[PDB]
Design a protein around this nucleic acid. Structure first.
Ligand SMILES: [K+]
Ligand SMILES: [K+]
Ligand SMILES: [K+]
Ligand SMILES: [K+]
Ligand SMILES: [K+]
Ligand SMILES: [K+]
Ligand SMILES: [K+]
Ligand SMILES: [K+]
Ligand SMILES: [K+]
Ligand SMILES: [K+]
Ligand SMILES: [K+]
Ligand SMILES: [K+]
Ligand SMILES: [K+]
Ligand SMILES: [K+]
Ligand SMILES: [K+]
Ligand SMILES: [K+]
Ligand SMILES: [Mg+2]
Ligand SMILES: [Mg+2]
Ligand SMILES: [Mg+2]
Ligand SMILES: [Mg+2]
Ligand SMILES: [Mg+2]
Ligand SMILES: [Mg+2]
Ligand SMILES: [Mg+2]
Ligand SMILES: [Mg+2]
Ligand SMILES: [Mg+2]
Ligand SMILES: [Mg+2]
Ligand SMILES: [Mg+2]
Ligand SMILES: [Mg+2]
Ligand SMILES: [Mg+2]
Ligand SMILES: [Mg+2]
Ligand SMILES: [Mg+2]
Ligand SMILES: [Mg+2]
Ligand SMILES: [Mg+2]
Ligand SMILES: [Mg+2]
Ligand SMILES: [Mg+2]
Ligand SMILES: [Mg+2]
Ligand SMILES: [Mg+2]
Ligand SMILES: [Mg+2]
Ligand SMILES: [Mg+2]
Ligand SMILES: [Mg+2]
Ligand SMILES: [Mg+2]
Ligand SMILES: [Mg+2]
Ligand SMILES: [Mg+2]
Ligand SMILES: [Mg+2]
Ligand SMILES: [Mg+2]
Ligand SMILES: [Mg+2]
Ligand SMILES: [Mg+2]
Ligand SMILES: [Mg+2]
Ligand SMILES: [Mg+2]
Ligand SMILES: [Mg+2]
Ligand SMILES: [Mg+2]
Ligand SMILES: [Mg+2]
Ligand SMILES: [Mg+2]
Ligand SMILES: [Mg+2]
Ligand SMILES: [Mg+2]
Ligand SMILES: [Mg+2]
Ligand SMILES: [Mg+2]
Ligand SMILES: [Mg+2]
Ligand SMILES: [Mg+2]
Ligand SMILES: [Mg+2]
Ligand SMILES: [Mg+2]
Ligand SMILES: [Mg+2]
Ligand SMILES: [Mg+2]
Ligand SMILES: [Mg+2]
Ligand SMILES: [Mg+2]
Ligand SMILES: [Mg+2]
Ligand SMILES: [Mg+2]
Ligand SMILES: [Mg+2]
Ligand SMILES: [Mg+2]
Ligand SMILES: [Mg+2]
Ligand SMILES: [Mg+2]
Ligand SMILES: [Mg+2]
Ligand SMILES: [Mg+2]
Ligand SMILES: [Mg+2]
Ligand code: NA
Ligand code: NA
Ligand code: NA
Ligand code: NA
Ligand code: NA
Ligand code: NA
Ligand code: NA
Ligand code: NA
Lengths: 186, 404
RNA sequence: AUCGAAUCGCCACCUACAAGACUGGAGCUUGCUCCCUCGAAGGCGCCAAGUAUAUUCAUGAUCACAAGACA
RNA sequence: UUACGUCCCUCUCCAAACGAGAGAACAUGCAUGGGCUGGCAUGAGCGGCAUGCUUCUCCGGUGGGGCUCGCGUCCCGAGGCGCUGAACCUUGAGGCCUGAAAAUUCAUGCUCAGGGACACU
RNA sequence: GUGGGAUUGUGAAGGGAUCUCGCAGGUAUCGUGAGGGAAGUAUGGGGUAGUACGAGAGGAACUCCCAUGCCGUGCCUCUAGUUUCUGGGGUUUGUCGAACGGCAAGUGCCCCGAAGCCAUCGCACGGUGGUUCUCGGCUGAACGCCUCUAAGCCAGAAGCCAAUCCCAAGACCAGAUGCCCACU
RNA sequence: CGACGUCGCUUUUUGAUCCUUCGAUGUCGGCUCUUCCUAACCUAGCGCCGCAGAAGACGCUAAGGGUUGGAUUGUUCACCCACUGACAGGGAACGUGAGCUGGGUUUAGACCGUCGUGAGACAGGUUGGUUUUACCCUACUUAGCUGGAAAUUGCGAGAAAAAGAUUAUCCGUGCAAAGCGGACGUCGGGUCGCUUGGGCCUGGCGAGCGGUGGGUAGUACAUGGUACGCUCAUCACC
RNA sequence: UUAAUGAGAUUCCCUCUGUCCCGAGUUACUAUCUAGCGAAACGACAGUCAAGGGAACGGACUUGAAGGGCUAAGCGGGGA
RNA sequence: GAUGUGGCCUGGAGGUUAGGACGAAGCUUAUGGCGUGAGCCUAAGAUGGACCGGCCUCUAGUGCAGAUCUUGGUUGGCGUAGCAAAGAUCUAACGGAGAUAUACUCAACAUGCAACGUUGGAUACUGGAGCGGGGAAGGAUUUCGUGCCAACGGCACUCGUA
RNA sequence: AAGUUUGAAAAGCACUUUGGAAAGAGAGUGAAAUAGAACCUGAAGUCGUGACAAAGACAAUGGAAGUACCUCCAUUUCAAC
């Protein structure tokens, strides 16, 4: 990032104070616009209100007009070092038109990259069950979807300055992939 | 010795060099000739290519075999959200060309426009135009603005406005860009003072595409063609392939020059960049200037076809989405892929031909799915054909019992 | 702020224009006569702010980039 | 030599051999699911005068042959019918919907001080 | 002046001296257009018209209207082509005991097949003024008349030049701007 | 149009010559592709006719554009069929073989005719017969980085700028006019030298033009996000 | 002269087709980028053109016209 | 092309005269001086370590830029062409220096990558005219175990017919 | 093909430290280690490095004249000389 936004340059106190002030400013600006839109729509008559549909967060199945989805998201803090998730991976969308003799090895690489991005880890280990599932229909018959259990652990070697994390990825047998979302399991 | 037989050369030497365009956006290299007897008006607008469909209409052309008969004509749909005028610029003539005199900025500028001055806006200090805003409205600032406006009145021969698109209004999930596209729009017609008066009244204001172009008019399109990267002479220039027996390959030009001159001439076809070139395309007739679907849902409904339908085909425009703003429907095709920003310009060629003067009345606008062979015009027509399906019955019985 | 430099005519009167078969002005006789500011000067600047009653100049020692130069 | 800022890592694809480009910069951004649009053409399994299917009580409910058991039943049998326009696929080098309205027209998950280098004798 | 460095061949640690360099520009837009490139071209039908002309036989053209060939620049709505979305089905031999699920036959093979790419095999678009040639004229002397020419003018070719179109400041733009910094 | 004569041009034919190349410049034709020439076939104009019209002859300016599909032949060439507005002639190492092709020509095998006693010969016929290399430099085609006007330096000063106490000492308007219209004050301190109510920095109060933030009302614009009124707090001009 | 036979030479016909009209799309392996490894040919000096003369076809010479520097992928005009 | 030169230079011999451990030969040079020139001489070596200079005469395998010259070394091309037939590998554990290898900041991703031998799984290949099991010719220790990674197996190795 | 021609003598680098090792950094021997091992002397060509000189594109080199800057070179002069 720029020098004026670097964590080391500013320090924790400065970065936190600037971030908090920015969020409070966004809150107040949204509050102004919510109040003005509420007032304007209230004065507005029926005929013109029928034109102004969805503006003051009136409609259903709609976003919040005054902010971003990310801002409204609730921050529960740092996740623990050990965490287990169940996630589906759409493998066919990554392996489309790939060389047939490379599909199973590439799928292993793609799953490792998928988990590594999710868990901020470079040491992603494939359990025998997952490797069997990927390869169980040959090198070119990889299933279009896989359900995986991702377990993050921490195990560093003595003398290392930075702590070591790693993940163990195993197959979760499923009769059907329909209706399955990403979950945090214990 | 002379070539055995004559054929025309491959390609147009006037579109050289076949290199990548400097800008992704279309830019008018010239504006239509100014006529002072007309009212001041804007000469250009910026649009976003959404997709293609086709229409049905009656041809009014006596002496033609299609006179008083129906025809099917492909059209291109381009979303046209309103532009915002933020600046005024004046140009004066010199023996070495036109020179900018100054720039009058609007007192308040959108976040969209100010993002164009940054590479990472979200992490930046976001200080653009802050000093200019503070300096304006002061005694020195007001005098400076009056000085610039008077300089335009006295010395400027050309008056142009600075306009930017509204990506927030174009609520498209595929364009990606959030910083506004900026272009200069010339003001034609009237005197310089009248041009300045219109530009001042347009400052900080929105401009609609219907305020610059009329329904049955024709327009020029400035756009950048689709890119293809490195391409061989066969596709890049249209040279003939060599026979199957050719050793070392047949997608080549056999002879690239005679012994003398001992050089390769610039007129010989060579492999290189194909596409992503700027093109100015003439005489694109406007078939429809549609309003926002939020203002009028029946966009594709005609007086002959009374089905209530929007311009967006079932399943959406492939790779683009829904047209949620005003749109311009041009006959035929325009250069460039979907999602690309394009410049509609008032025509520079004469508009006196019967084809260019014909009044366009549409009787049918196709809204079938552009995925596959679309056979339904609306959701309702599809439901009428199929009736209740397994999913619909499950949903209805669950709602009837579990929720009611 | 390195930096010592080469350049040696200033202007708020030239710094507007046009014509050289003819632009100082007339006459008729049309190449001569007459009238005029008399058709050959952009203004200053060159050591007393002005043409006089004056006034410190050295030894920087007889040439040397004027050893100074904001007219 | 202080700030604005730029680039690398990351993400996206209107760009693209590599550079370069267009963008993004906690962003429905990405991920999964749901619905839509479309493709294929009726999945597995079970059953045929119900106990199954369909409709609100009336409907529908095979097969050339062959095999046991004192007429009947109960078994083999390609194919056929029913549940079943079902099952599966549908964005990926990269379709649509979380901003018109809808007897569904979208949900949830992930991020928790972005890191690095220049800018700066 | 100020700041950063270097004096590197037979020692170490210190003081001078002398050199070399930096000391104001960065970053982001909108434009200018010198120069160079340069593109549209050709035919047919209708109408004029069985007219002008001609004893007859025969028999035209322009304004205007509609199409087409060649070429050029794009585009993918349609139609067609292309499938390693090995998408969904069928089907052969072998194979995991059968069924299911598949798998092997370097995509087993057959049919259909989205997206994308793509065909004058589909669709869209392809413009404005001047300078002159040849030539025909006006005025008009040389040479009382005459004469397009001798001085002057007019009209004027798919040539030529510019506009439009493409690249575009090593064409070094004292063109206009947005934020810092420097000077002040 | 042009006999008898006569004067030239051209190098798209052959010949004459032997200057260059024999420690090698790949030798026919076609395919492909670009460009040039004009002695102009079509296309744009224009004269002239033994030019009524139609169809044509001849000539002028003009090379911008165009100038084909096939049968036989390795052929260039030739001939025929067909289309067409027209199917003009040429050059570019008899353009073009590290571009192709290899039918021909020009090895070694073999057959025939003629010739020779013979081995063998024949611009006579016949059939079969390896077509190598680019990663270098330029050229061209695209694709990146990046200095630079004393075209790297000089400090070597030139604006398609303004128009004045020598650009300083305000801002508009006007013709480089005549004039006309405006400008935040006040009370102190400190520092330096055209002496002119001097320049500069800085403090305390009170205004004004503003920026930002909060509160509050109507309204406009695409309708989530900006603007405008009023009111507070703060910063800047100061 | 000759049935049968022939990777022998020739002509036509049916079938067939991307041989062609006229090109398009797809695949594996390359090229392309990276890690490791790592050559040869060739190499007077060098390498922008026009005309002129010249051993009569110049990258050097005469006179003009160009030419900021350094790079990646191609390409076969020249380097007789 | 000829000839001349108290003209230059090299190895050796006969004479003569000198130098050298306080530094001979050889080697190095922005070390200058002298000569029209071949060359000579001095200076410095933060070069070298034991021979050697001048002069007269004698003598010869006596002076190099190039013979597609000989031998040895180097070098641009160049980190370039390439290392693409015989389809294909994946995973965990163990083994190993071959790692999970970090100034400050900082929770891990954005700062130790890549590649290994064995065992167990998985996927596939050879398909009995076999990358199956034995012989001749030829080879001659390549056979076996342990150790070992310098060089070699055109990448790699902890493996090997090293 | 190939002189093992280190040094007078192996006195052939103990020991410390980093490294898996090779080796590096120290320390020692010796008159000398740039005499460190098939090691005397160590040329040319080519390459790396630090310092400096600059330099558009005239391929470079060269000739003749100056000039700018540098110079561990030579010589002369320093008093009425
Ligand atoms: K692929
Ligand atoms: K020829
Ligand atoms: K030819
Ligand atoms: K189709
Ligand atoms: K298709
Ligand atoms: K097969
Ligand atoms: K098909
Ligand atoms: K040839
Ligand atoms: K023979
Ligand atoms: K043969
Ligand atoms: K036979
Ligand atoms: K020259
Ligand atoms: K010689
Ligand atoms: K090399
Ligand atoms: K044995
Ligand atoms: K090796
Ligand atoms: Mg593309
Ligand atoms: Mg071949
Ligand atoms: Mg071949
Ligand atoms: Mg979308
Ligand atoms: Mg489609
Ligand atoms: Mg369709
Ligand atoms: Mg002086
Ligand atoms: Mg079933
Ligand atoms: Mg069914
Ligand atoms: Mg569906
Ligand atoms: Mg909605
Ligand atoms: Mg031009
Ligand atoms: Mg399938
Ligand atoms: Mg299979
Ligand atoms: Mg198998
Ligand atoms: Mg096409
Ligand atoms: Mg005339
Ligand atoms: Mg003309
Ligand atoms: Mg520019
Ligand atoms: Mg004659
Ligand atoms: Mg000769
Ligand atoms: Mg020869
Ligand atoms: Mg030769
Ligand atoms: Mg050659
Ligand atoms: Mg002519
Ligand atoms: Mg022509
Ligand atoms: Mg031409
Ligand atoms: Mg010839
Ligand atoms: Mg030839
Ligand atoms: Mg060849
Ligand atoms: Mg050739
Ligand atoms: Mg042959
Ligand atoms: Mg032959
Ligand atoms: Mg012969
Ligand atoms: Mg300079
Ligand atoms: Mg200067
Ligand atoms: Mg045979
Ligand atoms: Mg050579
Ligand atoms: Mg030449
Ligand atoms: Mg040469
Ligand atoms: Mg060549
Ligand atoms: Mg000897
Ligand atoms: Mg030297
Ligand atoms: Mg000899
Ligand atoms: Mg020698
Ligand atoms: Mg390579
Ligand atoms: Mg390879
Ligand atoms: Mg292979
Ligand atoms: Mg190969
Ligand atoms: Mg780490
Ligand atoms: Mg590792
Ligand atoms: Mg097998
Ligand atoms: Mg065997
Ligand atoms: Mg063994
Ligand atoms: Mg190896
Ligand atoms: Mg030594
Ligand atoms: Mg210097
Ligand atoms: Mg000199
Ligand atoms: Na031209
Ligand atoms: Na006609
Ligand atoms: Na006359
Ligand atoms: Na000859
Ligand atoms: Na004609
Ligand atoms: Na010549
Ligand atoms: Na050397
Ligand atoms: Na050196």
């Amino acid at each position: 990032t720029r020098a004026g936004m670097k964590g080391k340059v500013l320090g924790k106190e400065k970065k936190a104070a600037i971030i908090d002030a920015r969020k409070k400013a966004a809150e107040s600006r949204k509050n102004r616009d919510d109040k003005r839109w509420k007032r304007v729509l209230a004065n507005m008559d029926e005929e013109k209100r029928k034109k102004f549909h969805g503006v003051g967060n009136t409609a259903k199945n709609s976003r919040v007009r005054g902010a971003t989805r990310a801002s409204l998201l609730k921050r529960t803090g740092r996740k623990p070092d050990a965490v287990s998730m169940e996630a589906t991976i759409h493998l066919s969308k990554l392996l489309k038109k790939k060389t047939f003799s490379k599909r199973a090895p590439l799928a292993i690489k793609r799953i490792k990259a998928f988990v590594g991005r999710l868990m901020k880890t470079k040491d992603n280990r494939i359990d025998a069950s997952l490797n069997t599932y990927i390869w169980h229909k040959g090198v070119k018959g990889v299933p279009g979807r896989v359900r995986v259990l991702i377990q993050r652990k921490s195990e560093t070697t003595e003398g290392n300055k930075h702590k070591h994390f790693y993940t163990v990825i195993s197959n979760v047998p499923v009769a059907s992939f329909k209706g399955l979302t990403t979950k945090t399991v214990e | 010795s002379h070539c055995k037989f004559e054929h025309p050369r491959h390609g147009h030497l006037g579109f050289l060099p076949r290199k990548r365009s400097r800008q992704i956006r279309g830019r008018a290299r010239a504006f239509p000739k100014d006529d002072a007897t007309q009212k001041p008006h804007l000469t250009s607008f910026m649009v976003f290519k959404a997709g293609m469909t086709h229409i049905v209409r009656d041809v009014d052309r006596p002496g033609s075999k299609v006179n008083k008969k129906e025809v099917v004509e492909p059209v291109t749909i381009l979303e046209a959200p309103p532009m915002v005028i933020v600046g005024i610029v004046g140009y004066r003539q010199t023996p070495v060309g036109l020179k900018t005199i100054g720039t009058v900025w609007a007192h308040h500028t959108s976040v969209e426009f100010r993002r164009r001055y940054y590479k990472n806006w979200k992490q930046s200090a976001q200080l653009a135009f802050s000093r200019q805003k503070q300096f304006a409205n002061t005694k020195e600032g007001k005098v400076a603005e009056a000085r610039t406006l008077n300089a335009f009145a006295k010395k400027a021969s050309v008056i142009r406005v600075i306009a930017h698109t509204q990506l927030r209004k174009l609520r498209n999930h595929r364009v990606g860009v959030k910083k506004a596209h900026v272009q200069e729009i010339q003001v034609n017609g009237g005197s310089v003072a009248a041009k300045i008066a219109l530009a001042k009244s347009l400052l900080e204001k929105e401009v609609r595409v219907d305020s610059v172009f009329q329904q049955s008019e024709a327009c020029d399109v400035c756009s950048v063609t689709k890119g293809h990267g490195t391409e061989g002479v066969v596709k890049r220039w249209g040279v003939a392939c060599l026979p199957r027996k050719t050793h070392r390959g047949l997608r080549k030009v056999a002879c690239i020059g005679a012994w003398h001159p001992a050089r390769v001439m610039y007129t010989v076809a060579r492999a290189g960049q194909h596409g992503y070139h700027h093109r100015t395309q003439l005489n694109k007739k406007i078939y429809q200037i549609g309003r926002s679907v939020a203002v009028e849902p029946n966009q594709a409904t005609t007086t002959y076809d009374l089905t209530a339908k929007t311009i967006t085909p079932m399943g959406g425009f492939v790779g683009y989405g829904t047209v949620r703003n005003d749109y311009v429907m041009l006959k035929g095709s325009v250069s460039g892929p979907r999602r690309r920003v394009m410049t509609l310009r008032r025509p520079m060629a004469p508009q006196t031909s019967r084809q260019l003067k014909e009044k366009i009345v549409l009787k049918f606008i196709d809204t079938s799915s552009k995925i596959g062979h679309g056979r339904f015009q609306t959701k309702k027509e599809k439901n009428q054909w199929f009736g209740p399906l397994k999913k619909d019955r499950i949903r209805r019985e669950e709602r009837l019992r579990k929720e009611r």
